[PDB]
Design a protein that fits this description.
Blueprint (H helix, E strand, L loop, with lengths): L2 H7 L3 E7 L2 H10 L1 E2 L3 H13 L3 E7 L4 E2 L1 E5 L27 E7 L3 E2 L7 E2 L5 E2 L8 E2 L1 H10 L9 H6 L1
The structure holds 3-[2-chloranyl-6-(methylamino)purin-9-yl]benzoic acid (IV6).
């Protein structure tokens, strides 16, 4: 069912996360962590204190799809065991130093063709698939986008609700 999902998305904030490669999204799904550039890191740390749930919606560049979405469970932290991100051209490990812990809510894909009816008021009402890494998605758009994903019956949201 979708009822626990809707409870988790209640009054959530949503952010578009863009990844240059599939490898880091697979690593994020395996290890429950994410790292972003400092400008987005600051925005996510602020949002984490501000909302019952901060939702990251992932899209690998040029994939034509979203790869899933996750809830922040921590602010960023430094000093953990090195996350072996695959660094794109021009990107260094220091730029990706802050590490957020995340809990996956859906690890299934959604193709962009399925979200073409959703526009983001915070990005000039462009289709929600359009946006830079870190673009905030307004509540109603974000909620409907997350509800479009296929159910991920391997995840039990009971623990996530208790983190709230
Ligand atoms: C582990 N965290 C991350 N891993 C990867 Cl592979 N890419 C990330 C990222 N955080 C932001 N980006 C990003 C988004 C859009 C364009 C580019 C680019 O360099 O062209 C890079």
């Amino acid at each position: 069912g979708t009822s626990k999902l809707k409870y988790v998305l209640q009054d959530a904030r949503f952010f578009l996360i863009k990844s240059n490669n599939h490898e880091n999204v697979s690593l994020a799904k395996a290890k429950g962590v994410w790292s972003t550039l400092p400008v987005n890191e600051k925005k996510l740390n602020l949002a984490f204190r501000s909302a019952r749930s901060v939702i990251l919606i992932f899209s690998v560049r040029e994939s034509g799809k979203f790869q899933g979405f996750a809830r922040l469970s921590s602010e960023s932290h430094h000093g953990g065991s090195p996350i072996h991100w695959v660094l794109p051209a021009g990107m260094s490990a220091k730029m990706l130093g802050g590490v957020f812990k995340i809990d996956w809510i859906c690890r299934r894909e959604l193709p962009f063709t399925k979200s073409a009816h959703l526009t983001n008021p915070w990005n000039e009402h462009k289709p929600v698939k359009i946006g830079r890494d870190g673009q905030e998605i307004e509540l109603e758009c974000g909620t409907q986008l997350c509800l479009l994903f296929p159910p991920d019956e391997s995840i039990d949201l009971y623990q996530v609700i208790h983190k709230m």
